[PDB]
């Protein structure tokens, strides 16, 4: 049987990813399987190269999107799909949701252009699970005692990016687990233990 593909998303995440992967390998080891941990951008040597071009060569926003999805296509061909095919599970730090969030929400790339490239690269393939570490403007475990006062361009960009991640999450109810990353570590870890027990 094929492995499962899990992605981690969010603006902020790293701490919890390493821990989650250690727990997952502990669960997969008995079943004779392994976790391949990876990331985007830079999930392949080609992806590293395209990332450097994106950092260094100004270009049209649509051109940037094509290069991102090129990197993703190679990430699938070289790392993810071979792992899943041999029964290994994959955990990626970011995937297509991140492209929607930052390029669509943040930078204004139209949703239909983004969905067209997602379909081109993935067909109907989606991650089996996406854990989104949301960074909300208030803390629910302190709401009556702490209030962030209710934007500049940088603020507006991050607000749109957050909002697009949440839109993607709401649209994909069978795929997403939203974690409120403002909660105590022990609460986040209990929620993630529940995910691990459910996989």
CA dist 91 and 6 (Å) reads 5
For 51, 149, 181, the CA distances from 12, given in Å and listed in that order, are 19, 20, 9
CA dist 15 and 43 (Å) reads 19
CA 58 to chain CA centroid, nearest Å: 25
For 118-175, give the secondary structure using H, E and C.
HHHHHCCCCCCEEEEEECCCCCHHHCCCCCCCCCCHHHHHHHHHHHHHHHHHHHCCCC
CA dist 99 and 109 (Å) reads 10
Could you tell me which residues are annotated as the binding site for ATP? Answer: 10-14
CA 78 to chain CA centroid, nearest Å: 19
- Range 1-199 classified under CATH 3.30.499.10: no
Taking a C-beta distance cutoff of 8 angstroms, is the pair 41, 52 a contact? no
Count CA atoms within 13 Å of residue 22 on its CB side.
7
Domain map of the chain by residue range? 1-199
What tokens does 160 get?
């749109």
Taking a C-beta distance cutoff of 8 angstroms, is the pair 5, 90 a contact? yes
Taking a C-beta distance cutoff of 8 angstroms, is the pair 38, 29 a contact? no
Experimental technique, in short, is X-ray
Could you tell me which residues are annotated as the binding site? Answer: 10-14
CA dist 120 and 114 (Å) reads 10
Taking a C-beta distance cutoff of 8 angstroms, is the pair 192, 16 a contact? yes
What tokens does 158 get?
């991050």
């Amino acid at each position: 049987a094929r492995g499962k593909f899990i992605t981690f998303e969010g603006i902020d995440k790293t701490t919890h990813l390493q821990w989650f992967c250690d727990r997952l390998q502990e669960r997969l080891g008995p079943a004779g399987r392994h976790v391949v941990v990876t990331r985007e951008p830079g999930g392949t040597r080609l992806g590293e190269t395209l990332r450097e071009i994106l950092l260094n060569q100004p270009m049209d926003l649509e051109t940037e999107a094509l290069l991102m999805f090129a990197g993703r296509r190679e990430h699938l061909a070289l790392v993810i799909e071979p792992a899943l095919a041999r029964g290994d599970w994959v955990v990626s730090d970011r995937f297509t949701d991140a492209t929607f969030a930052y390029q669509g929400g943040g930078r204004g790339l139209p949703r239909d252009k983004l969905e067209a490239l997602e379909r081109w690269v993935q067909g109907g393939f989606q991650p089996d699970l996406t854990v989104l570490f949301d960074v909300p403007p208030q803390i629910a475990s302190a709401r009556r005692g702490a209030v962030r006062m209710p934007e500049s361009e940088s603020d507006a960009f991050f607000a749109r990016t957050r909002a697009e991640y949440l839109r993607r999450a709401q649209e994909a109810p069978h795929r997403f687990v939203i974690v409120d990353s403002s909660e105590p570590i022990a609460q986040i870890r209990k929620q993630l233990e529940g995910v691990l027990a459910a996989l």
